[PDB]
Design a protein around this ligand. Structure first.
Ligand SMILES: CCCCCCCCCCCCCCCC(=O)O
Lengths: 238, 117, 57, 106, 252, 267
């Protein structure tokens, strides 16, 4: 007859508790473990693998393989824009569906740097130079190459090595940001401009293409797990 | 979420009528939208559907040459155009949003189409 | 009487638990074993490559 | 193409009503029952042989297996006077059954 | 020079002249089954020179309007030498693979391929009620190819071959989580992969389970000017690594 | 699990190129932002605790709910146990190919009064029984049966008003891991069924009212919650894009990759 006294919170079912419970099959013998290749311990190892991002959403390219190719031609004027999209990895529909943006849609907060790789899928005799810029918020979108060269940029020369990594830094006032679209925690814009032209010889097709990749750095982190808004259900699956 | 159809229309035999089914409450480019026709003295009869993401339509084998389905991802609308109209095309047409396997959980309220002179 | 005294999750303190049941599949969740081996997905390559070195010789 | 055979059943208030429809061959428990109100609004009742949709009252229930199927209303009320169809989901294209309308006895 | 390799397995040799690095598995190399993990008692047969050599499949043509191809991996070698004859007389078996895709062109051509090796790739049928048959899922060392359109529901038992969903319902851009490699015709010439044995059981029957699927998808299509060579073929060679079998019975 | 911190950088003019790489090798670049610009030395106190496989999966999720009516024909439920009838637990378990966990199984039982006819119903508390029949056992066919003796099958009894019942189940499998995907057949002739329906043989779960039907019908409902503990997961996999269609297989209707915007330069 040890005297106890029960507190509020008794006989409740909180779906994220950590208790012990009596086993239904006593003295059960499980099958022994096996060395299977490819054990994942943390979900921030899936978000560190690069995946091709569909930059070219133009209302008839999403149901094709042309959503991934960025068109690049040989111009007559100079300083044109190739692409551009805001940096929202969980709300902007470019980065929304990729392997980084599918892990961020289970969580609410995120913090860290973001890598961006560009492979030049052109001919072997084609040259060119591009300007990969990133501008923090507060102003508008950069409209010239003069306005986008004042940000954090990198000049990419194509050649033997056909890739270049623009690593956006972590510039924010707060330690974390919101996955959903928020005006208080905006993150900026990522643009691309011709430095020089694409100069091709005779008997080479002048219309090349560029693929884009996205991953995370080793300082990435997430918080406050929730439910994804992409899957849906009306009746039971049978 | 509710599908809102257009009003009842009227045309000559041999003419062409274009209906509408304006969807709201959900992302339009996810689910396919089907069209069912009910003659006033019979049961319901399937016509076809359209994937709004890729604009792929597949009609029933009896309605292959008269009907034509189309959609636009901006205004969240699905249309259907009848052509070479006879007197057998006087019925009520429902638009339905197909659920998980074969179920039509949401329906329109139907438009009445009649032909005469 | 058993009583594994571990540490708690804090920012920048001990807690106590005992096991009562005879089966190992009836304990609490682990929730405090943090391990990371990301090299098998990001560099699944045979010949290792230096970062500052060019990738192709 | 599976022909879904279903014509005008009469029942009074507060009794047990049973509607049946027979398939052409084995459809393997893939049947759906719909209800068409007399102003022209259709809604799904039973999205399996027996599983009720969320928001349907407990008076409705379905049964059957193989070829013969059934739909049962155990206590007929006034708002249940409508037209009931059955629909197979085993073979392209989807075929609906003919209607079966209810009407008060005397 | 890190651009040349040389692979040797049995009485076959693969030399390459310009190439990327070689990608090994999930970090592990194919080895034999250990003694603390085995479950069958009888002694396995390890022939290991007669079955571990390079088997070359048929060649496919890369057109301009070409969408992709796929091979089911312990099924394409079911009529290849003494590897296909050991698979019939035995009940069990485990195998790791090495895969070498090769596709050569000039410095005036342009394009890109994704060579990805996906485990347990379940395909979905075109009609949403049935399952695909055996003849549509895999042919004996013949490429089954994707499409850029949608296969309609009136086809009773076929495979859904819309290429942007990769036949399994996932986004085709996110397929770079499986061990993979690109063939960029600007710099690359061949892609080499080594795959260990990945399964939830230590040994499995090889005739009712395809535990690997090789997919080749052109992301940037083949393009060339007028005058260059229009016929560009792709050739796949597979060699088993560290194979062994149990359960010897009649032929089937 | 503290994340890595940034180091200080200085202006450079050298032949060391961290930015230029080759994505054709199938290798993700390990560059850091201290290699391309001038950074200051910060130290990160951020941790990667809440992204672990234990914290991502060990949460209760509803997988089914079934209704049985007291004092009427067929007043008992059944459910062939699987995890492929809901949208949110199927999408979480199908990021990995092979899984190996325990369970923590909680039921939530409700009741509702049906439209009776007699006056002045007054019922006592209700008692329910949930029997788990392993694959091959004798199954019940009605409410008052011999099969509810439970001489060897495990079962719980529960009286209304108390805390919800909860058991715990070890790794019950034949193989070394659960398989979410299976690319194969059942028969050796490669006809018949295909896919993950071949490997799923886990039993059946029956439910009934213990109390007899006094004066008014009662319709109950039991919801079932899974919770994986001690999780190990192998071979990650891209998440599903299209919507699910059926239970037994992986059939789908195709969909676009993303939603569309009006231009390539629009923000
Ligand atoms: C208290 C009595 C009831 C006991 C019921 C035990 C139920 C066993 C559940 C087996 C877990 C199946 C997990 C799904 C496997 C998969 O991912 O394919």
């Amino acid at each position: 007859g040890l005297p106890v006294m029960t507190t509020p919170g008794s006989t409740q079912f909180l779906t994220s508790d950590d208790f012990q419970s009596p086993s239904a099959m006593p003295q059960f013998d499980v099958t022994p473990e096996m060395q299977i290749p490819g054990r994942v311990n943390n979900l921030m190892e899936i978000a560190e693998v690069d995946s091709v991002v569909p930059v070219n959403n133009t209302e008839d390219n999403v149901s094709s393989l042309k959503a991934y190719q960025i068109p690049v031609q040989s111009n007559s004027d100079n300083g044109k824009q190739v692409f551009g999209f805001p940096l929202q990895p969980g709300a902007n529909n470019v980065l929304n569906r990729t392997l980084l943006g599918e892990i961020l849609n289970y969580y609410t907060h995120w913090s860290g740097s973001i890598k961006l790789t560009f492979m030049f899928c052109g001919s072997a005799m084609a040259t060119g130079k591009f300007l990969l810029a990133y501008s923090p918020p507060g102003a508008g979108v950069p409209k010239n190459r003069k306005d986008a060269m004042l940000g954090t940029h990198v000049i990419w020369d194509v050649g033997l090595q056909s890739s270049c990594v623009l690593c956006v830094p972590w510039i924010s006032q707060t330690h974390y940001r919101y996955v959903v679209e928020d005006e208080y925690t905006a993150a900026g814009y990522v643009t691309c401009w011709y430095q020089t032209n694409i100069v091709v010889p005779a008997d080479v097709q002048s219309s090349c293409d560029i693929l884009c990749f996205v991953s995370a750095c080793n300082d990435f982190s997430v918080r406050m797990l929730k439910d994804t808004p992409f899957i849906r259900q009306d009746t039971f699956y049978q | 979420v509710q599908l809102q159809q257009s009003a009842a229309e009227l045309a000559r035999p041999g003419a062409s009528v274009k209906m509408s089914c304006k969807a709201s409450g959900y992302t339009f480019t996810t689910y396919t939208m089907h069209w069912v026709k009910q003659r006033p003295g019979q049961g319901l009869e399937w016509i076809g559907y359209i994937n709004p993401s890729s604009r792929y339509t597949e009609y029933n084998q009896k309605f292959k040459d008269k009907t034509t389905l189309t959609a636009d991802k901006s205004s969240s609308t699905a249309y259907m155009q009848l052509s070479s109209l006879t007197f057998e095309d006087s019925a009520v047409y429902y638009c339905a949003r197909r659920s998980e396997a074969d179920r039509f959980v949401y329906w329109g309220q139907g438009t009445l189409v009649t032909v005469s002179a | 009487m058993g009583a594994q005294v571990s540490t708690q999750k804090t920012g920048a303190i001990h807690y106590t638990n005992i096991n009562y049941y005879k089966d190992a599949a009836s304990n609490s969740a682990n929730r405090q074993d943090f391990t990371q081996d990301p090299g098998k997905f990001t560099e699944p390559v045979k010949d290792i490559m230096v970062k500052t070195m060019p990738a192709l010789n | 193409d599976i022909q879904m055979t279903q014509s005008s059943l009469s029942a009074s208030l507060g009794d047990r009503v049973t509607i049946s429809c027979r398939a052409s061959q084995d459809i393997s428990n893939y049947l759906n029952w719909y209800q068409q109100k007399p102003d022209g609004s259709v809604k799904l009742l039973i999205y399996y042989t027996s599983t009720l949709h969320s928001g349907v009252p407990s008076r409705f229930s379905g049964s059957g297996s193989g070829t013969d199927y059934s739909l049962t209303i155990n206590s007929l009320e006034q708002e249940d006077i409508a037209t009931y169809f059955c629909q197979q989901g085993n073979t392209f294209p989807f075929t609906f059954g003919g209607g079966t309308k209810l009407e008060i006895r005397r | 020079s890190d651009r040349v390799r040389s692979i040797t397995l049995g009485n076959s040799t693969i030399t390459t002249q310009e190439c990327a690095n070689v990608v090994v598995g999930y970090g592990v190399w194919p080895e034999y089954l250990k003694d603390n993990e085995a479950t069958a008692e009888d002694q396995p047969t390890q022939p290991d020179v007669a079955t571990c050599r390079f088997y070359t499949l048929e060649s496919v043509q890369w057109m301009k309007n070409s969408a992709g191809w796929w091979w089911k991996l312990p099924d394409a070698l079911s009529q290849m030498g003494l590897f296909g004859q050991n698979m019939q007389y035995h009940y069990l078996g485990r195998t790791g693979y090495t895969i070498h895709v090769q596709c050569n062109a000039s410095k005036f051509h342009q394009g890109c391929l994704l060579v990805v090796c996906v485990p347990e790739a379940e395909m979905g049928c075109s009609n949403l009620n049935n399952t695909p048959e055996f003849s549509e899922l895999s042919g004996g060392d013949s490429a089954r190819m994707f499409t850029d359109t949608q296969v309609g529901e009136s086809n009773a038992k076929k495979v859904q071959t819309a290429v942007w969903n990769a036949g399994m319902g996932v986004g085709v851009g996110n397929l770079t989580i499986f061990p993979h490699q690109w063939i960029n015709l600007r710099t690359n010439n061949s892609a080499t992969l080594v795959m260990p044995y990945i399964n939830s059981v230590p040994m499995d029957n090889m005739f009712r389970h395809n535990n690997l699927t090789l997919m080749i998808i052109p992301f940037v299509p083949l393009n060339y000017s007028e005058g260059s060579s229009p016929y560009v073929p792709i050739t796949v060679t597979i060699a088993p690594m560290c194979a062994e079998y149990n359960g010897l019975r009649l032929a089937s | 699990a503290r994340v890595a911190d940034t180091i200080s950088s200085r202006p450079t003019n050298s032949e060391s190129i961290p930015a230029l790489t080759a994505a054709e090798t199938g290798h993700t670049s390990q560059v850091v932002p201290s290699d391309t610009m001038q950074t200051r030395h910060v130290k990160n106190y951020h941790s990667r605790s809440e992204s672990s496989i234990e914290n991502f999966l060990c949460r209760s999720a509803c997988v089914y709910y079934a209704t049985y009516t007291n004092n009427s024909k067929k007043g008992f439920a059944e459910w062939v146990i699987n995890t492929r009838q809901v949208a949110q637990l199927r999408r979480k378990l199908e990021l990995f190919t092979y899984l190996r966990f325990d369970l923590e199984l909680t039921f939530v039982i409700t009741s509702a009064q049906q439209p009776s006819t007699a006056s002045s119903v007054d019922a006592p508390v209700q008692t329910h029984q949930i029997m788990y029949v392993p694959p091959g056992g004798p199954v019940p066919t009605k409410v008052k049966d011999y099969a509810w003796q439970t001489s060897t099958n495990p079962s719980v009894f529960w009286t209304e008003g108390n805390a919800p019942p909860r058991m715990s189940i070890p790794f019950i499998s034949i193989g070394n891991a659960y398989s979410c995907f299976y690319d194969g057949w059942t028969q050796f002739s490669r006809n018949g069924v295909y896919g993950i329906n071949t490997l799923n043989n886990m039993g059946t779960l029956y439910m009934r009212h213990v109390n007899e039907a006094g004066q008014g019908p009662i319709k109950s409902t039991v919801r079932i919650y899974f919770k994986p503990k001690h999780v190990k997961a192998w071979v990650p996999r891209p998440p599903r894009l299209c919507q699910y269609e059926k239970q037994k297989n992986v059939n789908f209707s195709p969909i676009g990759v993303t939603t569309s915007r009006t231009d390539i330069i629009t923000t």
